[PDB]
Design a protein around this ligand. Sequence first.
Ligand SMILES: [Fe+3]
Ligand SMILES: [Fe+3]
Ligand SMILES: [Fe+3]
Ligand SMILES: [Fe+3]
Ligand SMILES: [Fe+3]
Ligand SMILES: [Fe+3]
Lengths: 364, 365, 350, 350
Amino acid sequence: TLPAPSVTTGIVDADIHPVPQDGALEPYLDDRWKKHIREYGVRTTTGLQFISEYPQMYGGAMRADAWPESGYPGSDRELLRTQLLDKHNIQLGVLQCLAPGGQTLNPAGQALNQELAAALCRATNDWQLEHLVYPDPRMRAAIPVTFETPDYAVAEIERVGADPGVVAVLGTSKTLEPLGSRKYWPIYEASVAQNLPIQFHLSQGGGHANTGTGWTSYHTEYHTGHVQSFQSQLLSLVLSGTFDRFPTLKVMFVEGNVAHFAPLIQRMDYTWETLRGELPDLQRKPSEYIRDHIWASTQPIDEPEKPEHLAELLEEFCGDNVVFATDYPHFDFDDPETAFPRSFPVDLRDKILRGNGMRFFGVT
Amino acid sequence: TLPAPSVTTGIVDADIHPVPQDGALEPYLDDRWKKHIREYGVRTTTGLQFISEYPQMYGGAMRADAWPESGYPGSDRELLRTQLLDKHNIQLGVLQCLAPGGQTLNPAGQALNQELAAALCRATNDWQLEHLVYPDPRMRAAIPVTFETPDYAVAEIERVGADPGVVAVLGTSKTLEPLGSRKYWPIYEASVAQNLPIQFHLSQGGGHANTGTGWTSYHTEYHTGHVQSFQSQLLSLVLSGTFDRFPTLKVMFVEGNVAHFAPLIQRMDYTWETLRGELPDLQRKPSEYIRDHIWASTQPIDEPEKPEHLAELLEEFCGDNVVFATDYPHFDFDDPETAFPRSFPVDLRDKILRGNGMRFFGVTN
Amino acid sequence: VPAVVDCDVHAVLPSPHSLIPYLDEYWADQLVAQLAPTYEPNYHPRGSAIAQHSDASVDENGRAATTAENLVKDVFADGFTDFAVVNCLYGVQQIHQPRREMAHARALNHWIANEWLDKDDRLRASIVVPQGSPRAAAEEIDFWSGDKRFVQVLLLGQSELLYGREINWPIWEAAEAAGLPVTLHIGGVFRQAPTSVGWPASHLEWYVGQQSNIEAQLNSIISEGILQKFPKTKILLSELGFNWLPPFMWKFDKLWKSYRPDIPWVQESPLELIREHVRVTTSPSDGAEEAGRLDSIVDRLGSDRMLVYSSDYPHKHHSGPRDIENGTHSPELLDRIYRRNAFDLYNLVV
Amino acid sequence: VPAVVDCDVHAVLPSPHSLIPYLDEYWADQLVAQLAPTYEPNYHPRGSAIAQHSDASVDENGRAATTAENLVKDVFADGFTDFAVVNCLYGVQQIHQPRREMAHARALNHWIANEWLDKDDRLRASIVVPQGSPRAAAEEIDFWSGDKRFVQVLLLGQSELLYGREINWPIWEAAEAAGLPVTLHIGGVFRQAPTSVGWPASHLEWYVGQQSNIEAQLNSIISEGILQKFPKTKILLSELGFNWLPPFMWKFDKLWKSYRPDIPWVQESPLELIREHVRVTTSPSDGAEEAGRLDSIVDRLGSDRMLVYSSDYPHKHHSGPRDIENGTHSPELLDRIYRRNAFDLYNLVV
Ligand SMILES: [Fe+3]
Ligand SMILES: [Fe+3]
Ligand SMILES: [Fe+3]
Ligand SMILES: [Fe+3]
Ligand SMILES: [Fe+3]
Ligand SMILES: [Fe+3]
């Protein structure tokens, strides 16, 4: 009986990062998993006990003002309500929790123990609805699920997926197979059956090196390199015909940037002209799927040298499928009043801040 | 209706490599795939059009005397009848077709195009059934399926898996996830329903480097390294509780050697004694799964400096679960008459040639 | 006057036997005992629509560009091209046995000179190098440094380790000190997945996607400091498109501004560094050959010194070796693309 | 008289802050800026049963082996041990940024020297090296060559490329130049899946499984020619078991016979090369402590020279450091293991 999300004068924020407070998941966890995590932590695709393979540089990559009186940035419900939800008149802000907090900062779903992973995803979903979305229904939940055990993720989608406080299904940008692979179609089927779209957020981990040709060294390399994963996942989700099988499926590439998709998509078509006959069951020209199936968030906003270049390239992607995100509380946080260049078209700015997001999330 | 196999005076050979003659698979191939093969070949986990990342060193790694008048070793079924089946009194020759053409190791279920791969898997299974198993049912089929796409695999086990010319499901030793992963449980479920066991043969590819710590350089590294894939699979299949879930599933590791398993399992038990707490749903002690679930084939037989160590290690692994293979027509082919050391006891050799394989493949007398 | 260079055309080795007159007795007996397995790659599958255009002089098997006579015939038939740079993609880099990798890369470059460079003096070639051992790659650059018909060093787009890693520095060292630019051509050793999220299931997926690895290789080369340790280095992107460069450059510049104290030695922007050091061939054009698009892509790069002409003979792309003119209104641009930029690479005159 | 040496015990770095006194201001400031992310490995998860046995001295936080006083109070209490080789497994080798890897590897060793070696002359240690840059790895080995309390080079069982690659030959060269044995310890850089068939789903499956990767390092070391190019090389397997060795040795020998001309420089059997150049620590014993199994495995190795005693302090194993006596009835064997075999590695007299 919670109401559907209503965006009128306010804006849509597609990427918000809450963190559970120390101990706060333990009400939704079996005793065996509390024991497990005390004894072993949340093992993942590293050899490190407490950190990921590229730990963040300058203060954990948090903006230095978002630290509360007790917890990590994102862990205080009141500071997030004031420093974010009111301050920018966000009427729909989508929680994307990528850490169960405490001593572990990797996404739940990427725990190498997948049974632990599904319990962590479940406790996270129960915690973010009871602690944030329901007391402050401006926030809604993108549910983390175990994309590398589809059985467990279908089960979770079917357990909380119809909850009005749920607007999306949260995955990660890196995976063991390209997301266009049949392994993940059951999760799409179970998503669609709840008329839910799916957000893939920037991540490390996954199983392979962070580029297709080696492990990066320097932080410019790691952070810039994040967009390669997204470039790789589009080509597979499109050229696999995932969207033929699932024609009501909405996927958004969250924090992969936007501009680079356009000459990628363009190169896909040009290549596909000559070699289309390798994949004859592909029903449409590759670029044709974008407007129906592929969204992106703005943050971190592209910054071309000629600002006129920006809106040119967002339109070459698809102007109706770019949606605004703060990425609160991270350091490269984008602001709704200051993100776009001074010369930015104003109709495009309003439907990113509003229109396109309402479409992606089924707002009417 | 083809009769069940019967072993009496002869032996089981759990690993024989027949090859389709050129174009022999096309009668069973939808025409869209015959064209895809002309244009792109079979794209796998290489950047190479025709070979795998480690091509054979000397004369195709084949026996020098096993070449027909025309074609690849294993391509002429007459030569295979006289040179192998007749010559060694083989009464159950389990076929494991490793490539769709005149190549040594280029497995079909490993095509990156998994619609292509399930196609060649189905074609291969129709071709070896009509062309070898039914003309001479001393041979039977281990049927390749696409383990990396469990939907197409459960369907191929369903299509042909009940055929009496079929004794086992055929997999590869290397895979993208370790075989105890839930990903592959749908295949184990479909195999239990057809009363079939599973053989995992030595492979390249799979999606990772060929060791867990880099690609090998010289051939001694590549061929000795095959054993490592099998160590890692056994650990995943046992500790994941895969056999808790499917307590009648039988798997054979084929051409992974045998003796190395014994200390592996011993290290597995010993570590678990301290660290069992991490996996408290596992129902049995790790080594207790071996007797009912883990089998191995003998070729290329272990050759310790002191021969009496062979039987020691085979009993430590599990003397009931070792099964003879020749690996015909590969160059390290094992001869039943000469593979066992001079002091080898006869009760154990007779199990390995006969009873052991009979019970794994559901054969009676 | 600067000469019109075709910056990317391909010799196609017919079969491993073609190397036998260029190997020791050991390596040639071994190659025949081994039944001559072929390391022909799958970068352009021989039977697919990109492998060769229809208007190609094929040989007795139906294969374009297995001889110097078949390529010279086609490439220079319209008198427009003065020189061609030959890149043989025969996959010696995927030979894991490193001794055989050296021996087959050496013998490949011998075949290229004797039967292509000695045949037509309008032909230049790159040195193929065995990148499995950087010090062995270095020694083969130096072995071919006396013969100036070799005008660049060939490296595959996908490597074992990123080209900026200290492990790989002896390749830029030897390249700088022999005068040669290094080209990255589409292709790879395939010792990890071609993408960071797994293996591409189709050749098309793989072919389109290899751009991602080139952002990674440039960010590696720049961030690790190759442009400051070997400041004369020039990097040619042969056949990887080029439209993706601007949005990658913009992010790499933005984050350099924050992260700069992590890489203090890079004191000029990556924006400038890429304009001054990186050239990209034009085939494929990836749709910059549509109306006004070549001007747009040159404007987004912020330079017109980068694009260098190539046909990609004999590969068939959706648009042809000169339909790029349909993209621009400047005869100055096309003059730069057609011959002036490539003077910076090779210094070849009419 | 050869000394009884504990060939593998462990120091545990409290936190990265413990590195602050041994870091240049450039890195001390930046570490504190980074809120000091800790590279504590998951090789022995600190809360699992293997991390420490209940008889081990602990600090205020309940952690064993974080000070020289606690370890020395525990290891030498009974008077049986004369020397212990400390290995600090803090995960500097998993730092991707190559310059911070080096600096932290150096501070760590400096930590080891001041807070441990200087505090008790019965302690020796390994040299932690940055394996991301073989050049830096060898320079690190030269720098500690001066201090002879450092008695071996520490490498992890899982590396980025196999240790036998040419790329990695500087480390072998620097180790031989200093007369230092090279040890592989369980642990890894995790720059690929820990197995050739992907990622283990638990630490237990990982921990049992790392023997396979040592088969590959030993095959690569021997196959690529390390023991002929650096014939004084000694290799000690540390805390990787040993019962897996014979079947690996026999198969490797059998295949060497089959492939001699592929590796012509290998003129001795890998059976003989391994018995001569490979030593193995005895903790964990993995079932060789049961009746007669220690005689049986030495029979299977073909050598009584390979096993050297360790306790693996402070880890907990199913059997104790001296329980290996239940597997033998040879006083002379227990003498090679406790005393004489380790003399070949460290030449330490009591
Ligand atoms: Fe974010
Ligand atoms: Fe962020
Ligand atoms: Fe075989
Ligand atoms: Fe074989
Ligand atoms: Fe080209
Ligand atoms: Fe240890």
